[PDB]
């Protein structure tokens, strides 16, 4: 509702972000295999215990 | 094809059409596939018939082999078979020639143009030739 705008400044960041490469990864089975795989490692193979945090997205 | 057995159920004799109908199930557990001519021969050997007046259809197999179900008809006085069995079954069994007819769409168009042409047509064509030659 205001008569004001700089059309040149639109998309300023997108033109200046550097583009990086991606590392190739082997195939990971998906679907029922992924659901079965996560079930097999859901209670036994754990390293985030002692506290009960259960951080499935670790941060450092 | 080692040992196959045939069993008939719902047996019924129809004197109105001079035929005898049954539901035929064949057991073939030994990885055996069955044609229709051999089953016709089996039905011919049974009921002491000529094996030429036996008509079978259906014959659909179950899962993983085993038992196959179908319908079977036998006819006495084989002229009864010829006069009663439908033409498509007759041409399937090979006892009647396949009549050569043009496509249905073509028949429709030829009927339409024939209807539009009044009278016989030869006289109209001759008059048109008289006017146009």
């Amino acid at each position: 509702g205001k008569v004001h705008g700089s059309l040149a400044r639109a998309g300023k960041v997108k033109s200046q972000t550097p583009k990086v490469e991606k590392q190739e990864k082997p195939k990971q089975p998906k679907g029922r295999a992924y659901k079965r795989l996560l079930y097999v490692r859901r209670f036994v193979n754990v390293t985030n215990m002692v506290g009960g945090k259960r951080r499935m997205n670790p941060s450092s | 094809s080692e040992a196959v057995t045939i069993r008939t159920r719902k047996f019924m004799t129809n004197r109105l059409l001079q035929r005898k109908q049954m539901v035929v199930d064949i057991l073939h557990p030994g990885k055996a596939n069955i044609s229709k001519n051999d089953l016709r021969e089996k039905l011919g050997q049974m009921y002491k018939t000529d094996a030429s007046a036996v008509q079978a259809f259906g014959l659909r197999t179950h899962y993983g082999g085993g038992r196959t179900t179908g319908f079977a008809l036998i006819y006495d006085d084989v002229e009864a078979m010829k006069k009663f069995e439908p033409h498509y079954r007759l041409v399937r069994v090979g006892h009647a020639e396949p009549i050569q007819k043009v496509a249905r769409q073509q028949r429709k168009q030829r009927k339409n143009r024939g209807k539009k042409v009044f009278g016989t047509g030869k006289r109209l064509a001759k008059r048109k030739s008289k006017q146009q030659d």
Binding site: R32, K35, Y39, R42 | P29, K31, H62, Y63, G64, R67
Partner: protein, 178 residues
């Protein structure tokens, strides 16, 4: 043709899809019974819910009512024949006490596992697709076939195939070639 073909949805999604207690419950249930996804849980829950609804409607009516006795006998007889309901305590009140486990314990998956010849629960799932199990005189391949009262003694192996023999071949012949 002239009349429509009736169809219905056999699975219903829950109202709350992100509650931890239920999510862990289905996670445990799927792992135990080798369920591919939550669709099987929804179908079993819906069937159990419909059975509960019929039981509640029948229990609403008074005792010795002809409609209640007839329908109550029908559901009890159907449940015991399917094996979900126990041979005792058939009084239209324990049908409500029936749980998802009772429905799932009559599945073809668990039944063959308790009968053996499985060595695992996921092994049965990879095994039914190869048509290795016959139920009586029919070789069933659907995991959710549900075994009946008399099919316990008739869950047998397939006559063909490497377990049954009869020239298995295929991969065996590939290995035999070289």
């Amino acid at each position: 043709p002239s009349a429509p073909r009736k169809q219905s949805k056999t699975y219903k999604v829950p109202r709350r899809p992100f509650e931890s207690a239920r999510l862990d419950a289905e996670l445990k249930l799927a792992g135990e019974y080798g369920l591919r996804n939550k669709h099987e849980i929804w179908r079993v829950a819906l069937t159990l819910s419909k059975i509960r609804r019929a039981a509640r409607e029948l229990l609403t009516l008074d005792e010795k009512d002809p409609k209640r006795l007839f329908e109550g006998n029908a559901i009890i007889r159907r449940l015991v024949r399917l094996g979900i309901l126990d041979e005792s305590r058939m009084k239209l009140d324990y049908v409500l006490a029936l749980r998802i486990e009772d429905f799932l314990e009559r599945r073809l998956q668990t039944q063959v596992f308790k009968l053996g010849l499985a060595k695992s629960i996921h092994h049965a799932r990879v095994l039914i697709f190869q048509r290795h199990i016959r139920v009586g005189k029919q070789i069933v391949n659907v995991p959710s076939f549900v075994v009946r009262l008399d099919a316990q003694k008739h869950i047998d192996f397939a006559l063909s195939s490497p377990y049954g023999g009869g020239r298995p071949g295929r991969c065996k012949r590939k290995r035999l070639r070289s």
